Amino acid sequence: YHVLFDSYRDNIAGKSFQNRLCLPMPIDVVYTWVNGTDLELLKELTELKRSNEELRYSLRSIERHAPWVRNIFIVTNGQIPSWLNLDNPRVTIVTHQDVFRNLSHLPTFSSPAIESHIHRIEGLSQKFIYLNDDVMFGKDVWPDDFYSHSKGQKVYLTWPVPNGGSGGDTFADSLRYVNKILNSKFGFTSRKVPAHMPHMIDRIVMQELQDMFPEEFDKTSFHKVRHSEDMQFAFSYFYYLMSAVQPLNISQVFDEVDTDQSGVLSDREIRTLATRIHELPLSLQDLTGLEHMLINCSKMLPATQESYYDPNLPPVTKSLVTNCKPVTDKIHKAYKDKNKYRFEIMGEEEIAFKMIRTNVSHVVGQLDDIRKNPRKFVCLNDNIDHNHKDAQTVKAVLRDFYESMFPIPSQFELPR
Amino acid sequence: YHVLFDSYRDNIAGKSFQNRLCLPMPIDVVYTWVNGTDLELLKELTELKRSDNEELRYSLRSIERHAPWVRNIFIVTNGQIPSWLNLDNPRVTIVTHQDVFRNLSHLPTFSSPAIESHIHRIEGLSQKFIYLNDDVMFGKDVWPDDFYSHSKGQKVYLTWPVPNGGSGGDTFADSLRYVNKILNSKFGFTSRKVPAHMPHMIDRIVMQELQDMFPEEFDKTSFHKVRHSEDMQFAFSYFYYLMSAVQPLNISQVFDEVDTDQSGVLSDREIRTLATRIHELPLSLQDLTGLEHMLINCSKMLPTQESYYDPNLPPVTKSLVTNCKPVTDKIHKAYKDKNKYRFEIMGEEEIAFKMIRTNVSHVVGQLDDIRKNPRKFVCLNDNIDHNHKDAQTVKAVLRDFYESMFPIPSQFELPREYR
Ligand SMILES: *[C@@H]1O[C@H](CO)[C@@H](O)[C@H](O)[C@H]1NC(C)=O
Ligand SMILES: *[C@@H]1O[C@H](CO)[C@@H](O)[C@H](O)[C@H]1NC(C)=O
Ligand SMILES: *[C@@H]1O[C@H](CO)[C@@H](O)[C@H](O)[C@H]1NC(C)=O
Ligand SMILES: *[C@@H]1O[C@H](CO)[C@@H](O)[C@H](O)[C@H]1NC(C)=O
């Protein structure tokens, strides 16, 4: 009963470090589902005139390989579930009326507009995982695969934007436009496309991005069809995480310098302050000049006897160091800008970006590649020519692979 | 309240994953300290004729300030204790050799490796602990993640490979070559590196398995009361046993990973999965036909949802796949023996290694660089000649550095004789 509390309270400090040892919990999952049959196609056709079965196996992968998620949300245009189980209260369907701030955009018919407003679902945990109904987990995946406290959120990158793009691509042009925006805002940098995977997102960082970039997100959500200059959901979040700048708070610098927590620096702490300010090697002249500028600032600005080197040195405090312009400028010049969030970068180590080209000889090869080498993230986008004699056979073998991977029943299905 | 209990078990699976998501806790700290007292000097003089910096008090402050999540601190010493130490504090325990060595004939150990090889056998010790050599201290902020991670196992720190040149070395390279030859005879030959001198995370189970796998060498190194070429080092042996331990393959594990249905019988899909796991791409119909031929032959030589492409196939259960010699041989050839313990390797990114050569400007530069760029682990080797007139100056400089880095008295000390 009290053993759980006492175990984390049993250290030399007597504190509790659950926020640093047990990861952030709980974690939710957000999917997306669209049905291209009958009414939706009719709406698209009339809009043009005026102007498969992957989700089940994805949820089965959620049950099998990632059993640490709390809730599953599926965003729909009002399409009621066809095989989901609503008796279990751990899965719910959220209509776009909730995510949209304005009801005039409910005929979405576009993916970035849906993806931009995910973080406004009520009941969502602090961090949530986003899957686009063509990805799944093929190996045991744990939250430390996405986020570790010491090295921050984990970012997976892939081919660079200019190299992997091509002319005449609607999606490539949007990524280039987002690149232009971020290079004109945070400065020029080499950018790499995030991997197509079940990304992990944080509500706080995304909301900060919303507040920082309201007009552009509103503009890209305004479009009713996928446009050439939309903003990607994963790339924006990840690169804002990378390039988030934090102001240099001098008070924390002094707090870390002043180990006594007494607010006054002894003769030994000026050594640490000067060495953090200065660059190697360090001569006595620089330290004497630091002491001289300190006394000059104390004398020019009107204002337990610790012994110092120079008796002309008055005791130094926060009210002195923070209001001393030369030392603050020297600290700012010395201390580089530090990122507000931490991150770790890797590549395509365990990501199965498999492409279906409507050639069963190659489809079976790709599936065998997946089967021999199990991977944590699998991408199986359904690209079929549908005008080929053996096109149904590709779907048949793909569904055979799906059945092979996850044949066990899941509780999120009606026992028909 | 029900919410407090359900918070850790609120999930789809309904199971508590605390043993995996909450890191290995608790963790203890062990120290090896010795003092140059009159009795120790007299016993050393007697042994040879027959045949202090007080860095502990500052490492304790470093543990208190930078590593507040440790549980207990154990120190092993030759019966002597500092006067300032707070023995009345029920969180630091002095440990004598009467409960460390298996035999009482080595109590005049007088050699660090003998104590090191047995430091893991103290009663009440946590399954994982951090080894402190009384000269290394912490910095920045240290968490169990800096030593161990569940997804990647432990983290081993390697500085630079052993030279193997020979024709030199007094008492350090010889022990490295000794352990190197032992591990070459046991696990094979490879280019090995010397672990960094730093606080090391040690497992009691792995250490016990190491001691039960090389028992003769370890009672030999416990035999030597003076450090010699014939001793087996602590960090080198532990880390390379962890990095080179292997386990024989168990057919049940692969049989269960290929049995996605968890039914005990393999359909065509599972047979294809096994075939593509064991064989190389591009898999063709010939390999599957040969596998089915081998299956039917091994069946002839001796429960719902049943369907097969070939009617000759009996239900492929654990019995039929476990006892088939040639396909088990091909399975072993495909999936070799892997390491039993996970590990992670990295270099010299965040380790501080400083030496004092009595050249005052360079030791001052070293400590100034430590101050400028704090690092997680600091190692200050003291080998001052003590005949240079600046020995007291170096002592004062090191005292100044230690006091500046940790001026606050620790919970393990009695504040006495102020200033
Ligand atoms: C700087 O850190 C101090 C620490 O005492 C804190 O009180 C203060 O709010 C911080 N300032 C800013 C602008 O964040
Ligand atoms: C599939 O690719 C192979 C590559 O060797 C080619 O020979 C074959 O014609 C392709 N099949 C189809 C149906 O395009
Ligand atoms: C090895 O396989 C056997 C098969 O009977 C199983 O019972 C046992 O638990 C396995 N042992 C290990 C150590 O994996
Ligand atoms: C002492 O150290 C300095 C580096 O700070 C070096 O230049 C000098 O040559 C060294 N030796 C002597 C004898 O001064």
Author numbering:
A (entry chain A): 6 to 56, 89 to 340, 351 to 463
B (entry chain B): 6 to 56, 88 to 338, 350 to 466
Sentences from the paper on this structure:
First, GlcNAc-1-phosphotransferase (PTase) transfers GlcNAc-1-phosphate (GlcNAc-1-P) from UDP-GlcNAc to mannose residues on the high mannose glycans of the hydrolases, following which the GlcNAc moiety is removed by uncovering enzyme to generate the M6P monoester.
Replacing S1 (233 aa) with a 29 aa linker sequence corresponding to the S1 region of the Dictyostelium discoideum PTase and deleting a large region from Notch 1 (N1) to the S1P cleavage site allowed for shortening of hPTase by 680 aa. Both 2D class averages and 3D maps show that S1S3 dimerizes similarly to PTase and has quite similar structural features as the catalytic core of PTase. The S1S3 structure comprises an NTE motif of two short α-helices, a large catalytic domain (the stealth domain) formed by the four conserved regions with a Rossmann-like GT-A fold, and a C-terminal small helix-bundle domain consisting of the EF hand and the three-helix S4 domain. Moreover, the EF hand interacts with CR4 of its counterpart subunit, thereby contributing to dimer formation. This finding explains why mutations within the EF-hand cause disease and inactivate the protein. S1S3 superimposes well on hPTase and zebrafish PTase (zPTase) with an RMSD of 0.63 and 0.75, respectively. S1S3 has essentially the same catalytic pocket with the catalytic NDD motif in the same orientation as other PTase structures. However, while hPTase fluctuates between an active and inactive state due to an auto-inhibitory motif that moves in and out of the catalytic pocket corresponding with the closed and open nature of the S1 domain, S1S3 lacks both the S1 domain and the region from N1 to the S1P cleavage site that contains the auto-inhibitory motif. Thus, S1S3 is likely locked in a constitutively active open state, consistent with its kinetic parameters.
